[PDB]
Design a binder for this molecule. Structure first.
Ligand SMILES: CCCCCCCCCCCCCCCCCC(=O)OC[C@H](COP(=O)([O-])OCC[N+](C)(C)C)OC(=O)CCCCCCCCCCCCCCCCC
Ligand SMILES: CCCCCCCCCCCCCCCCCC(=O)OC[C@H](COP(=O)([O-])OCC[N+](C)(C)C)OC(=O)CCCCCCCCCCCCCCCCC
Ligand SMILES: CCCCCCCCCCCCCCCCCC(=O)OC[C@H](COP(=O)([O-])OCC[N+](C)(C)C)OC(=O)CCCCCCCCCCCCCCCCC
Ligand SMILES: CCCCCCCCCCCCCCCCCC(=O)OC[C@H](COP(=O)([O-])OCC[N+](C)(C)C)OC(=O)CCCCCCCCCCCCCCCCC
Ligand SMILES: CCCCCCCCCCCCCCCCCC(=O)OC[C@H](COP(=O)(O)OCCN)OC(=O)CCCCCCCCCCCCCCCCC
Ligand SMILES: CCCCCCCCCCCCCCCCCC(=O)OC[C@H](COP(=O)(O)OCCN)OC(=O)CCCCCCCCCCCCCCCCC
Ligand SMILES: CCCCCCCCCCCCCCCCCC(=O)OC[C@H](COP(=O)(O)OCCN)OC(=O)CCCCCCCCCCCCCCCCC
Ligand SMILES: CCCCCCCCCCCCCCCCCC(=O)OC[C@H](COP(=O)(O)OCCN)OC(=O)CCCCCCCCCCCCCCCCC
Ligand SMILES: C[C@H](CCC(=O)O)[C@H]1CC[C@H]2[C@@H]3[C@H](O)C[C@@H]4C[C@H](O)CC[C@]4(C)[C@H]3C[C@H](O)[C@]12C
Ligand code: SF4
Ligand code: SF4
Ligand code: SF4
Lengths: 158, 318, 97, 107, 165, 70, 176, 388
């Protein structure tokens, strides 16, 4: 057969992307209420595992961090610690108003006004709390975001 | 032709371990009123491939290991021993026909605690080691009753040849004459492989970090393959030991079918048990052995030495 | 006996989807091969089905169009492709398509 | 030869698989990291004594292993007495620990 | 640049050191793991390295300072070091033993033909060019901000290098 | 439904069936259509080495019968 | 009125003692626990096939915000700032002025959707049904800036979702 | 002090209660000292309430014990109503008991199942959240929100029950006792579960009262105390139910008490469905409760009261009250001080989990490290209310 380098890189990129989105093992900070809706996303009706998303993942095997609740100033150092220990590729999902931008404690002295002040965020899931279905939509949006990555294709043209 | 026959044993073992992970997630799901993997490939048939490709391209963790040598030995020792345990199993013919197959398997499994011990010592974290030490004491503890129970069974078989266990059960399964021993055997294979309600390594991770905390995705994935290889092998051994299939030398493949179905059903009973009970506390799984299983295993060992003599049913030596 | 009848339904699903090619397309696109009444179709191509003998929550569903607003959605579909008129019916906020 | 060729393959396959896993992923340049991070190991007698108890019981098992071959002897009364004697000794060793504050790991 | 954009501020730094640098991280890794230093007559090279933050500060003040336009700058560290001693000092910090005495490839060449030619070039002294002093930045010593850089390489009481007047 | 777990168990079953099936078939192929000879004890080894000389081709699975008695 | 959850006295006849001995040695209750899990394996899973199937909602569901219009097409909002005053999270920012035709209309209407708690007090307080919480719950974004809605966005949401919003109001306005 | 193990649940697991940093001294397997550090979900809620009207402050109470949303609302509403000197109408009192018991079921499913999940018994968690998911639909149908309903308000409830809700609640309640029975078929007589809970974290009756415990933590030790029976507050004097009482004060009795409370909640829910009376849902007094949207668009007085209620808010007479209810976790109380304006001067929240967690060190003495997981679970700690 005959094939260019550009074609080979495009197909290998699709393979690794398909594997990375098909097997997303999430770490979940269950900081507050939004953790309860994260638990409903694992329960029978939605069953995130059927997408390949394991119920429980350790911090140092995790692929995505889900920040489900209010990030207080006392807790912020610990969350950045966990984020650094995560091996790459690593993605953060910000779930709910509190994590997205402080929410209903935005004007508090003890609350970080959004977790994007601490860690980079890939997807923002609105709600207080987002419904289990709304979080599931967010995770499926992360899978499509990963599908569009072009790591190998960029590397070839460097 | 023998090199081929080895790769007709090694490669199929790895694939079975690959697809035991799918079967585990789906069986647990349906016992939990959910579907489990069913999106990646039809009925989740590509979930193992996605997980495998995902881990090996994952960025490695930082080894930060006290002993580099013992860091790389632990996964090699664990993976190599798990594959080696399969060479004497009669299905219906062993790859290597040993006259002391049972002692070879018993002796080899005793070396499997070095992988736990080395990785813990090479981890470089003080709580990781205390995790490894707790696990080792559990593994060697339940080896004691496995050896004595295995000794009791072999006093009705009359040999250490694994193919002689088939002949012993030609008329009837050893599950009848030895159901008190089959109960304690089956549990000890749960505790030997560190499975629920004995998976104290995973359950108490926050309290005491497990020994495999330090390895990267690729190396950690290899520790996990060796662990389900042992779980499949210990249920294949459970089937040969207590549920012996009849062998028709003209139709060996009929043995391999009936034999394989019995191996799966016990292997899926491991999943069944995981989904049904809470975990043991460490002092409780030590109480279960040293104070319940061991007294009964010794009493039944005394019984199974006396019984063949007082019924004139001593098996042949050959 | 019932086992044979069960298998008959399984085969009926293969013909109910227009043959093996039709039955495999829904299997890989939707991960589900049930068949139900076509309640309607909408101007973008989505098709809507119900089967009232299913349990509450599965008795309605949509098979998303393969293209919408100039984007190839054979594989890439998302819950935001349901238009507002059907959004009410699909989420059971109403009882009338 | 066949046992040797079987073992050599099983540990050669394991060695290649581990060597590929450890090193080959290192060729991917995932950025570069910052800095990761007193106490000692407090020796516990309970974890030691369980290891020893296994050692002593495990040896008494080594004497029990020939029992399947030992029932082919003409002198069955002698064999039967010494078999029950050794298993009963394994029982007395257990009873001594049980009744003299020994199974402390069991608690 | 000086012809296309005459009002441009051209900044000339020396080897810059920092957490993610490829200068001290180069001496700690490439020299150590799998190799013994490839130093080519290390006694003949004099180096004047500058901290990253001082360069960052210098660049900002060139934006906010209106006299910087049209001027070329030279950002240099407080001290001049001997390339041999520098490598030695790096090793002491990283607790890697130092004993005086890798092909380019795809991916990302780590150690290359030209990189060596540069690590050996001697830091030119151009007094007429203004430096960090003229932008309100004090050059920071290597010693302070070298334990910061090299604490990662260190496995699991240190003496400084000797400056060249 | 529960029976959607079977395809996974079927693939796992096919995987655990190949080892036994291949070993039996390979034994027949290398040993002239009969089971591989089992020699646990020295007497069984003596007979196998006797058969090896008897055949004349140096294979212990080549049986010689009354036709050679002459 | 109270009851004793665990004040039984176990019977000490031999028949009962043997029952507990049989239970202890034969693992009876543990087998019973295995039976219940076995029964669930043959029960139908409660999972639904998201996104092809959706969870049931009601007309009162509180989702994404939108600004509505009258049938003629004029905006319902008169810039009374009752929603801004009530908002528990201070998520709403309003400015107003007289429009070119002298009408009382806003020039700035903003909702910081990352401040909002999706409580629906603003729709309860609006006198003209101008601000509503729609039925959309699938609008997660990739950047924080995409969740700070100005007037145009909320007007566009009203134009986008009016068909459904009006029907939901029709279904619930009598309860309100 | 053989070793100090600083155990941070920072890398949280599937519990969702929050995050707890636990500092312990382990003299071997045993625990000699336990020291919870609890600032991680402190959000300044009590100070923020001072800048909000009474209506604006109500949603804060949904987000305290975020598994007892409508019970926290009722406590706030009962406190405010007491200062206002008004009375909610009889229909709303029945709706508030009805959803108070649907909330108790919601809380105990989380309490028992996540307690069992931490001790390795994962399956009942999935069995019961299919039920909580059906209960979340009742919340969404009356309020529009699955969790933070904001539905129970001073004066009554925001809206009336939609037509067809009571039938669906009855259908849920009819099949629910069987769901509890399946749960007991996996835990009540299970020897492994009993070994993990029996004679763990024993609390004496005398130490319970002095340490401030309430709820199941008292009744497990044999104290006959329930606020619904001794200080009834809505229609709880008009419904028959029994209080489960423990005898040994251990985790296993506390586990049994909660499972029996779920049965008594279904008993109560049955009576509420049959006795639901007709009428209005909020106090018919428009200087406190907003008028109907039809009247506000027709009547001048209604528009004025609507305008002022949603801007200034109703003013509350000066005074201070301590109101407590039998929340699912325990006694939930608010000390609310009014300066006479429309914004509270001080709102102190009494969380039952605050005292229980402070009593952890007492209970953990002389237990192994793996027991502490069981002790925290049996307390039913959520850090939304521990910290506020
Ligand atoms: C190339 C071999 C190198 C060795 C690789 C490692 C060992 C061998 C493993 C091979 C992997 C085999 C599994 C491939 C999975 C195919 C994806 C799939 O399942 O389709 C469903 C998916 C489904 O799409 P989806 O993921 O968006 O589904 C969304 C969910 N639904 C549909 C329910 C709404 O189809 C795809 O999108 C294609 C993904 C890209 C596949 C790229 C891999 C194909 C092989 C290319 C090799 C190139 C080599 C150079 C020539
Ligand atoms: C042991 C077996 C286990 C089972 C199989 C394991 C899976 C095997 C199948 C997957 C192989 C995928 C290899 C790519 C690895 C992932 C690459 C990636 O993520 O991108 C990061 C990088 C992207 O490069 P980068 O430089 O842009 O990334 C770093 C970016 N900076 C600099 C900013 C930090 O990808 C690679 O490095 C690719 C390495 C080479 C891959 C092979 C290409 C050969 C084909 C092209 C040549 C054709 C000539 C004709
Ligand atoms: C190693 C085991 C791999 C065995 C499965 C085949 C994997 C390769 C699949 C592939 O390359 O095509 C994926 C393709 C990629 O699709 P595509 O990229 O060709 O997109 C074309 C879509 N149409 C034609 C509709 C416009 O997706 C699939 O069809 C899935 C095939 C895998 C199904 C295997 C299940 C049984 C095992
Ligand atoms: C590791 C396993 C090593 C070999 C184990 C052999 C065995 O136990 O089976 C006996 C087996 C089974 O014994 P058998 O008694 O059941 O049958 C033998 C065959 N008959 C009966 C016909 C006589 O014996 C053999 O097959 C002989 C194999 C040749 C001896 C090989 C010696 C070198 C082995 C390597 C030494 C260890 C390497 C370093 C290890 C590092 C530390 C662990
Ligand atoms: C009941 C199983 C049954 O139907 O009979 C077993 C049948 C006969 O057994 P056979 O291998 O021919 O030899 C018997 C004496 N040697 O052999 C077979 O039926 C073939 C194997 C299929 C039955 C598997 C039964 C395995 C039971 C143990 C697993 C338990 C699973 C959880 C319950
Ligand atoms: C007819 C038999 C009648 C029964 C014999 C007596 C049974 C034991 C009596 C007894 O005292 O039991 C109580 C006590 C149990 O101790 P324990 O509960 O563990 O204390 C800590 C609390 N958890 O018991 C003990 O503490 C000591 C019990 C030690 C028993 C160890 C025996 C191990 C060997 C098993 C028997 C094997 C056969 C022995 C040889 C018999 C030869 C005829
Ligand atoms: C005529 C003379 C002939 C000689 C014999 C005559 C007498 C025969 C009658 C005696 C029968 C002996 C029974 C042997 C089984 C072992 C008994 C046993 O050890 O059970 C007790 C053990 C702990 O007891 P515990 O509940 O903690 O009580 C308090 C402590 N005193 O409880 C436990 O074991 C707990 C185990 C927990 C893990 C269980 C998880 C799996 C359960 C389901 C598996 C079902 C069985 C699987 C069978 C597999 C067979 C292949
Ligand atoms: C898997 C299928 C499980 C069947 C459903 C559960 C079941 O039927 O078991 C209940 C039965 C009665 O147990 P129980 O309720 O405790 O009352 C007995 C009074 N002593 O419990 C039993 O009788 C089960 C006893 C099984 C026999 C012991 C197991 C021996 C294992 C080796 C074979
Ligand atoms: C290591 C193996 C890939 C090896 C191979 O197939 O060749 C992969 C395939 C599927 C994986 C497993 C499943 O995908 C997910 C399981 C769930 C928990 O996260 C524990 C790890 C978990 C048990 C995984 C362990 C390991 O990473 C697996 C087993
Ligand atoms: S966003 Fe809402 S539900 Fe989530 S933690 Fe904050 S207040 Fe609770
Ligand atoms: S829903 Fe509540 S928090 Fe959100 S904008 Fe409306 S009043 Fe403010
Ligand atoms: S949206 Fe309604 S309440 Fe808000 S300013 Fe406009 S008219 Fe007033």
């Amino acid at each position: 057969p005959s094939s260019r380098g550009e074609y080979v890189v495009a197909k290998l990129d699709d393979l690794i992307n398909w594997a990375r989105r098909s097997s997303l093992w999430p770490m979940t900070f269950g900081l507050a209420c939004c953790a309860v809706e994260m638990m409903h996303m694992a329960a029978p009706r939605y069953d995130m595992d059927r997408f390949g998303v394991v119920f429980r993942a350790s911090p140092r095997q995790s692929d995505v961090m889900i920040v489900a609740g209010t990030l207080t100033n006392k807790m912020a150092p610990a969350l950045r610690k966990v984020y650094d220990q995560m091996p790459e590729p690593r993605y953060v999902v910000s779930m709910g108003s509190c994590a997205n931008g402080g929410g209903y404690y935005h004007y508090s002295y003890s609350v970080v006004r959004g977790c994007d002040r601490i860690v980079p965020v890939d997807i923002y899931v609105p709600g207080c709390p987002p419904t289990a279905e709304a979080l599931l939509y967010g995770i499926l949006q992360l899978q499509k975001k990963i599908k569009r990555e072009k790591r190998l294709r960029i590397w070839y043209r460097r | 032709m023998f090199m081929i026959n080895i790769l007709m044993l090694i490669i199929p073992i790895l694939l079975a371990v690959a697809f035991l992970t799918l079967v585990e997630r789906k069986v647990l799901g349906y016992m939990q009123l959910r579907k489990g993997p069913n999106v990646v490939g039809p009925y989740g048939l590509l979930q193992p491939i996605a997980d495998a490709i995902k881990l090996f391209i994952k960025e490695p963790l930082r080894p930060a290991t006290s002993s580099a040598s013992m860091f790389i030995l632990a996964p090699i020792m664990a993976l190599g021993l798990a594959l080696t345990m399969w060479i004497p199993l009669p299905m219906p013919y062993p790859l290597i026909n040993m006259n002391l197959g049972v002692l070879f398997m018993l002796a080899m499994s005793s070396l499997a605690v070095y992988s736990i011990l080395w990785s813990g010592w090479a981890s470089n974290s003080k709580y990781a080691l205390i995790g490894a030490l707790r696990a080792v004491a559990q593994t060697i503890s339940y080896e004691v009753t496995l050896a004595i129970i295995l000794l009791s069974v072999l006093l009705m078989s009359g040999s250490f040849t694994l193919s002689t266990l088939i002949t012993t059960q030609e008329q009837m399964w050893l599950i009848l004459p030895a159901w008190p021993l089959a109960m304690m055997w089956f549990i000890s294979t749960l505790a030997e492989t560190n499975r629920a309600p004995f998976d104290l390594t995973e359950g108490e991770s926050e309290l005491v970090s497990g020994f495999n905390v330090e390895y990267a995705a690729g190396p950690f994935a290899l520790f996990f393959m060796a662990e389900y290889a042992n779980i499949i092998m210990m249920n294949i051994f459970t089937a040969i030991l207590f549920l012996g299939t009849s062998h028709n030398p003209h139709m060996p493949e009929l043995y391999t079918i009936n034999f394989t179905i019995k191996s799966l059903l016990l292997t899926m009973s491991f999943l069944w048990i995981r989904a049904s009970y809470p975990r043991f506390r460490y002092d409780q799984l030590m109480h279960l052995l040293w104070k319940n299983f061991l007294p009964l295993t010794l009493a039944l060992c005394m019984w199974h030495v006396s019984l063949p003599i007082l019924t004139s049913g001593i098996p042949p030596q050959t | 006996m019932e086992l044979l009848q069960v298998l008959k339904r399984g085969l009926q699903q293969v013909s109910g989807h227009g043959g093996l090619r039709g039955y495999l397309r829904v299997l890989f696109r939707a991960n589900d091969v049930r068949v139900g009444t076509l309640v309607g179709e909408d101007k973008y191509g989505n098709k809507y089905y119900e089967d009232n003998k299913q349990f509450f929550g599965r008795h309605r569903w949509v098979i998303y169009t393969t293209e919408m607003n100039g984007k190839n959605t054979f594989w890439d579909v998302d819950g935001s492709m349901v238009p507002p008129e059907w959004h009410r019916w699909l989420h059971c906020m109403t009882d009338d398509p | 030869m066949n046992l040797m060729l079987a073992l050599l393959t099983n540990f050669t396959l394991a060695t290649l698989l581990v060597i590929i896993a450890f090193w080959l992923p290192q060729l991917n340049v995932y950025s570069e990291k910052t800095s990761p991070y007193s106490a000692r190991l407090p020796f516990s007698m309970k974890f030691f004594l369980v290891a020893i108890t296994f050692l002593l019981f495990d040896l008494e098992i080594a004497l029990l292993l020939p029992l399947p071959w030992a029932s082919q002897t003409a002198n069955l009364n002698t064999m039967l007495t010494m078999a029950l004697f050794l298993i009963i000794l394994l029982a007395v060793s257990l009873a001594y620990e049980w009744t003299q504050k020994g199974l402390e790991w069991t608690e | 640049v000086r012809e296309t954009f005459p009002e441009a501020t051209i900044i000339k730094p020396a080897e810059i050191f920092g957490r993610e640098d490829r200068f001290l991280n180069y001496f700690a890794n490439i020299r150590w793991f799998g190799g013994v230093p490839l130093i080519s007559l290390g006694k003949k090279t004099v180096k004047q390295p500058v901290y990253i933050v001082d360069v960052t500060k210098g660049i900002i003040n060139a934006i906010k300072d209106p006299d910087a336009r049209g001027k070329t700058f030279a950002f240099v560290g407080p001290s001049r070091y001997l390339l041999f001693d520098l490598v030695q000092y790096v090793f002491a910090v990283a607790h890697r033993p130092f004993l005086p005495y890798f092909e380019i490839s795809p991916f990302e060449p780590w150690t290359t033909r030209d990189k060596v030619e540069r690590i050996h070039t001697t830091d030119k002294i151009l007094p007429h060019l203004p430096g960090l002093e003229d932008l309100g930045v004090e050059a920071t010593p290597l010693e302070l901000k070298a334990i910061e850089v090299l604490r990662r390489h260190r496995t699991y009481d240190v003496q400084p290098a000797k400056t060249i007047p | 439904m529960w029976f959607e777990v079977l395809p996974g168990i079927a693939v796992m079953g096919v995987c655990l069936f190949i080892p036994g099936m291949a070993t039996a078939r390979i034994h027949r192929f290398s040993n002239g259509g009969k089971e591989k000879r089992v020699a646990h004890y020295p007497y069984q080894w003596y007979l196998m080495e006797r058969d090896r000389r008897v055949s004349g081709v140096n294979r212990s699975y080549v049986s010689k019968g009354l036709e050679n008695i002459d | 009125t109270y009851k004793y959850v665990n004040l039984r006295e176990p019977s000490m006849d031999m028949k009962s003692v043997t029952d507990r001995a049989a239970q202890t040695l034969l693992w009876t209750e543990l087998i019973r626990g295995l039976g219940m899990t076995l029964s669930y394996l043959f029960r139908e899973p409660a999972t639904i096939n998201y996104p092809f199937e959706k969870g049931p909602l009601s007309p009162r569901f509180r989702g994404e915000h939108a600004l509505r219009r009258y049938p003629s097409g004029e905006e319902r909002c008169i810039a009374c700032k009752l929603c801004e005053a009530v908002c528990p999270a201070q998520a709403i920012t309003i400015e107003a002025e007289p429009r070119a035709d002298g009408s009382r209309r806003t020039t700035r209407y903003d909702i910081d959707m990352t401040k909002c708690i999706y409580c629906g007090f603003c729709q309860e307080a609006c006198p003209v049904d101008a601000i509503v919480e729609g039925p959309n719950f699938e609008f997660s974004t990739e950047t924080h800036e995409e969740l700070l809605y100005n007037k145009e966005k909320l007007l566009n949401n009203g134009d986008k979702w009016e068909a459904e919003i009006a029907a939901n109001i029709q279904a619930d306005y009598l309860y309100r | 002090l053989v070793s100090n193990l600083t155990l941070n649940f920072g890398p949280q697991h599937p519990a969702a209660h929050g995050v707890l940093r636990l500092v312990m001294e382990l003299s071997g397997e045993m625990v000699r000292k336990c020291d919870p550090h609890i600032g991680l979900l402190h959000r300044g809620t009590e100070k923020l309430i001072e800048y909000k009207t009474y209506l604006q402050a109500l949603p804060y109470f949904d987000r305290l014990d975020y598994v007892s949303m409508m019970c926290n609302e009722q406590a706030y509403s009962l406190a405010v109503e007491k200062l206002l000197n008004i009375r909610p109408p009889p229909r709303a009192q029945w709706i508030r008991v009805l959803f108070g018991e649907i909330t108790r079921l919601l809380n105990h499913i989380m309490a028992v199942t996540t307690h069992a999940l931490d001790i390795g018994a994962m399956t009942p968690f999935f069995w019961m959240f299919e039920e909580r998911e059906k209960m979340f639909e009742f919340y969404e149908r009356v309020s529009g929100a699955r969790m933070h309903a904001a539905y129970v308000r001073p004066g009554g409830v925001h809206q009336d029950l939609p037509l067809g809700l009571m039938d669906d609640i009855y259908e849920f309640s009819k099949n629910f006792s069987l769901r509890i029975d399946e749960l007991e078929e996996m835990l009540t007589n299970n020897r492994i579960w009993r070994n993990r809970t029996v004679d763990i974290g024993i609390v004496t009756a005398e130490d319970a009262l002095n340490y401030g415990f309430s709820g199941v933590m008292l009744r497990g030790s044999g104290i006959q105390w329930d606020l619904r029976k001794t200080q009834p507050y809505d229609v709880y004097d008009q419904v028959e139910f029994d209080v489960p009482i423990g005898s040994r004060g251990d985790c296993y009795d506390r586990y049994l008490c909660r499972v029996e409370e779920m049965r008594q909640s279904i008993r109560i829910i049955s009576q509420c469905l049959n006795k639901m009376p007709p009428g209005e849902i909020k106090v018919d007094d428009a200087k406190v409760s907003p008028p109907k949207r039809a009247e506000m668009k027709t009547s001048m007085e209604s528009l004025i009261h609507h305008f002022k209620l949603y801007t200034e808010g109703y003013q509350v007479p000066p005074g201070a009250t301590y109101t407590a209810i039998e929340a699912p976790k325990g006694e939930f109380g608010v000390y609310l001080v009014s300066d006479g304006s429309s914004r509270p001067y001080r709102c102190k929240i009494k969380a039952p989990g605050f005292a229980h967690l402070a009593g952890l060190d007492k209970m953990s003495k002389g237990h192994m490290l793996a027991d502490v997981v069981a002790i925290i679970g049996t307390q039913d700690i959520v850090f939304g209310e521990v910290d506020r």
